[PDB]
Amino acid sequence: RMLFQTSYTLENNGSVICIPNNGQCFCLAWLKSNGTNAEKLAANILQWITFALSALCLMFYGYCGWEEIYVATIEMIKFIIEYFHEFDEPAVIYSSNGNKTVWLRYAEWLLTCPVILIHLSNLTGLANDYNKRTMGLLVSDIGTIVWGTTAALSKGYVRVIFFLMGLCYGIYTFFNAAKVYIEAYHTVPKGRCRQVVTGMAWLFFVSWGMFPILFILGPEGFGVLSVYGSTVGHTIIDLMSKNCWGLLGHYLRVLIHEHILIHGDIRKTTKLNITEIEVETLVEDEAEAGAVSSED
Amino acid sequence: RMLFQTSYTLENNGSVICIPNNGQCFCLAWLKSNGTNAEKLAANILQWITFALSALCLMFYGYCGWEEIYVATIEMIKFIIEYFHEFDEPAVIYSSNGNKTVWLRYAEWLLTCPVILIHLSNLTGLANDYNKRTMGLLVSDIGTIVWGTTAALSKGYVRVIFFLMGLCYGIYTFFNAAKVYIEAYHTVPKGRCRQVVTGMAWLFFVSWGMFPILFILGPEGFGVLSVYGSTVGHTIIDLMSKNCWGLLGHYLRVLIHEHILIHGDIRKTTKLNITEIEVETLVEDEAEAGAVSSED
Numbered sequence: 156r157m158l159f160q161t162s163y164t165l166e167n168n169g170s171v172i173c174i175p176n177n178g179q180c181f182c183l184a185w186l187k188s189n190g191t192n193a194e195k196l197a198a199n200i201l202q203w204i205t206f207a208l209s210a211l212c213l214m215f216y217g218y219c220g221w222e223e224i225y226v227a228t229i230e231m232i233k234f235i236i237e238y239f240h241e242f243d244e245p246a247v248i249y250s251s252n253g254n255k256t257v258w259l260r261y262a263e264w265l266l267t268c269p270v271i272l273i274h275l276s277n278l279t280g281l282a283n284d285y286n287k288r289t290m291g292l293l294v295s296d297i298g299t300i301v302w303g304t305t306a307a308l309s310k311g312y313v314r315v316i317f318f319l320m321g322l323c324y325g326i327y328t329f330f331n332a333a334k335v336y337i338e339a340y341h342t343v344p345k346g347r348c349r350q351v352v353t354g355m356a357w358l359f360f361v362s363w364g365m366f367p368i369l370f371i372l373g374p375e376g377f378g379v380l381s382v383y384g385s386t387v388g389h390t391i392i393d394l395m396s397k398n399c400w401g402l403l404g405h406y407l408r409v410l411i412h413e414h415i416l417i418h419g420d421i422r423k424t425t426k427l428n429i430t431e432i433e434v435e436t437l438v439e440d441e442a443e444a445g446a447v448s449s450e451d
Numbered sequence: 452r453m454l455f456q457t458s459y460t461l462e463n464n465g466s467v468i469c470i471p472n473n474g475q476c477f478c479l480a481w482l483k484s485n486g487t488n489a490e491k492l493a494a495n496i497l498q499w500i501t502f503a504l505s506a507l508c509l510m511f512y513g514y515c516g517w518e519e520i521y522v523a524t525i526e527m528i529k530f531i532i533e534y535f536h537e538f539d540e541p542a543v544i545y546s547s548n549g550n551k552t553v554w555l556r557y558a559e560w561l562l563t564c565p566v567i568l569i570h571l572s573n574l575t576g577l578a579n580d581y582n583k584r585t586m587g588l589l590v591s592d593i594g595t596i597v598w599g600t601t602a603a604l605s606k607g608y609v610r611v612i613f614f615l616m617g618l619c620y621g622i623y624t625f626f627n628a629a630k631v632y633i634e635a636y637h638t639v640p641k642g643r644c645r646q647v648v649t650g651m652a653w654l655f656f657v658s659w660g661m662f663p664i665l666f667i668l669g670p671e672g673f674g675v676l677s678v679y680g681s682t683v684g685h686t687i688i689d690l691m692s693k694n695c696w697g698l699l700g701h702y703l704r705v706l707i708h709e710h711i712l713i714h715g716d717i718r719k720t721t722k723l724n725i726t727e728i729e730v731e732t733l734v735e736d737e738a739e740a741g742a743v744s745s746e747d
């Protein structure tokens with residue numbers, strides 16, 4: 156099927172390759188199989204299931220709230236491209252050092268990373284404002300993906316360096332995202348809302364932590380995983396990272412806004428020390444509206 | 452110098468190319484000259500001058516303020532890479548459809564685009580908070596660069612579509628960046644500070660507007676410009692876009708903070724209508740502290 160040169164002859168007992176002078180790019184590296192039929196079949200099923208969840212979340216959101224729909228919007232456009240051109244350039248980049256780079260994956264990431272991280276900075280949906288910390292989250296997260304993408308495109312010691320630069324940026328991201336979830340927990344009402352925030356934290360750190368692991372395991376790292384193998388791994392963490400997290404997000408948002416509809420915006424002053432941080436604790440009791448220095 | 456296959460023989464009257472079976476990638480497309488010695492010489496001079504300005508801005512900032520230093524930090528690391536590996540993968544990506552993509556350029560852009568756009572959302576340096584508009588600026592700007600990068604990696608009608616998707620995102624970015632500059636102008640004190648804001652607006656829209664123009668003109672578009680040609684064009688708008696704009700930014704910041712040191716934080720309520728917008732006008736007179744509905 157390929158639109159690089161696939162036909163060649165071996166000459167001088169396979170020491171010389173002869174190709175048609177038809178202007179096409181040529182590299183043996185590009186023609187290596189993407190994996191077993193079983194791996195491919197597994198990958199095509201999880202992709203349809205991802206298309207189904209992407210489709211239902213969008214229509215569901217159809218019945219503020221812009222960050223969840225967008226991630227599902229980008230996810231549906233991703234599947235139409237996968238369906239028609241999954242391994243066609245530039246969904247996959249076939250480069251001169253022999254690498255296959257899944258640009259489709261990294262592009263989606265850079266497009267939605269501000270959307271997801273804005274949403275991280277807006278769990279309750281009540282804020283109109285974003286602090287200095289939000290901005291450090293976006294700068295560090297974009298750096299991570301840019302160094303990572305560079306590492307995927309490189310080889311040898313150059314790949315090692317850019318991966319390590321991605322990790323330094325990534326640690327800063329994880330560290331600060333952890334504080335946000337802590338503040339969110341002590342901001343939202345005491346019941347079901349704190350269960351959902353806790354659920355979102357687990358999904359976030361498991362799914363986000365798995366991406367550098369799948370990088371090291373895939374063709375971009377030690378080549379342990381095949382390309383279909385990598386696809387399957389990515390579909391699982393993709394469903395968690397995007398669809399499910401936005402669904403939990405939308406759910407949380409509904410719950411918080413309904414709290415304002417029933418009890419109203421009753422804030423508090425929980426002074427945390429996880430440092431000397433502060434928080435406005437939404438409560439269901441008008442009585443409760445005081446400074447609660449809960450040093451962690 | 453290249454580390455893809457550069458040596459080949461023509462056989463059957465140039466209808467067959469024979470190459471050593473040494474595992475190297477091969478494409479005639481990759482070997483096309485990058486331009487004239489004159490273009491190259493011009494490009495190497497502007498790069499050193501860019502290194503010099505990057506070096507002086509950094510040391511100058513050495514005598515809040517994080518966004519300007521970072522852009523100069525990234526710019527210096529860019530020049531050390533240019534010096535050693537300007538046309539080596541993945542500073543340039545040589546891909547299977549024959550394209551040469553200057554990943555070095557787009558990577559820098561994605562890394563600093565949040566930094567610059569945060570700084571756009573913080574001209575005075577007094578704000579601790581960022582509105583919903585800032586967040587739309589970051590989402591739209593990153594989309595622009597991602598669609599653009601995809602367009603550079605593609606060919607034919609696929610390149611046309613992604614470029615057009617980049618333009619749609621880009622228009623949203625320009626439109627909203629214009630409002631920010633209008634608000635900044637009516638926020639800062641009446642004298643020299645409004646000259647600098649006006650200077651920053653001109654630099655911003657000229658330099659940012661030139662990037663899609665250089666894309667259409669370069670190998671990524673209609674191939675009018677050569678690679679050295681493109682480099683020279685990029686060095687000129689690079690000096691404006693990064694060094695000079697951050698220098699004007701730092702200057703503005705100093706002026707505003709010195710206003711608080713002399714007169715103090717004396718805000719107003721200029722209600723704009725460029726819609727029904729509002730602004731806190733810093734003034735040098737304690738007397739002036741009222742609502743001035745200046746409908747534009």
Ligand SMILES: *[C@@H]1O[C@H](CO)[C@@H](O[C@@H]2O[C@H](CO)[C@@H](O)[C@H](O)[C@H]2NC(C)=O)[C@H](O)[C@H]1NC(C)=O
Pocket residue numbers: 168
């Ligand atoms: C043809 O190329 C092949 C490379 O496989 C050569 O075959 C092998 O030769 C080496 C000896 O240097 C042995 O170690 C291997 O056992 C051989 N067989 C295989 C399957 O690898 C062969 O010598 C070459 N012929 C000429 C004329 O150069």
Ligand SMILES: *[C@@H]1O[C@H](CO)[C@@H](O[C@@H]2O[C@H](CO)[C@@H](O)[C@H](O)[C@H]2NC(C)=O)[C@H](O)[C@H]1NC(C)=O
Pocket residue numbers: 464
């Ligand atoms: C060798 O290939 C060349 C291609 O350049 C052929 O030369 C040309 O042949 C065509 C005729 O079909 C003419 O229109 C051109 O004027 C010729 N010269 C050039 C410089 O292009 C040549 O015919 C081929 N020989 C064989 C045996 O196939």
Ligand SMILES: CCCCCCCC/C=C/CCCCCCCC(=O)OC[C@H](O)CO
Pocket residue numbers: 310311312314315318319322325326329364367368371375376377378
């Ligand atoms: C913060 C998130 C938590 C989890 C994050 C996991 C950290 C991974 C680090 C491992 C160091 C090992 C070096 C990795 C360097 C990558 C380069 C590489 O794989 O190169 C391929 C090789 O040259 C050809 O086989």
Ligand SMILES: CCCCCCCC/C=C/CCCCCCCC(=O)OC[C@H](O)CO
Pocket residue numbers: 606607608610611614615618621622625660663664667671672673674
């Ligand atoms: C908002 C900023 C203001 C200024 C912004 C300028 C707008 C550029 C649009 C031009 C439309 C023309 C179509 C451009 C499509 C690009 C694809 C391309 O160049 O393809 C190469 C071609 O196939 C091989 O020669």
Ligand SMILES: *C\C=C(C)/C=C/C=C(C)/C=C/C1=C(C)CCCC1(C)C
Pocket residue numbers: 263264267271299300301302303304318321322325363364366367370396397
């Ligand atoms: C599409 C949705 C999500 C949440 C995508 C996330 C991607 C990452 C968290 C990637 C992280 C990387 C790290 C931490 C370091 C190695 C390079 C990566 C870009 C793979």
Ligand SMILES: *C\C=C(C)/C=C/C=C(C)/C=C/C1=C(C)CCCC1(C)C
Pocket residue numbers: 559560563567595596597598599600614617618621659660662663666692693
């Ligand atoms: C390094 C500093 C700056 C300011 C880089 C800016 C880059 C752009 C403004 C690129 C814009 C593009 C547009 C508007 C549409 C075509 C694709 C581009 C990515 C080239």
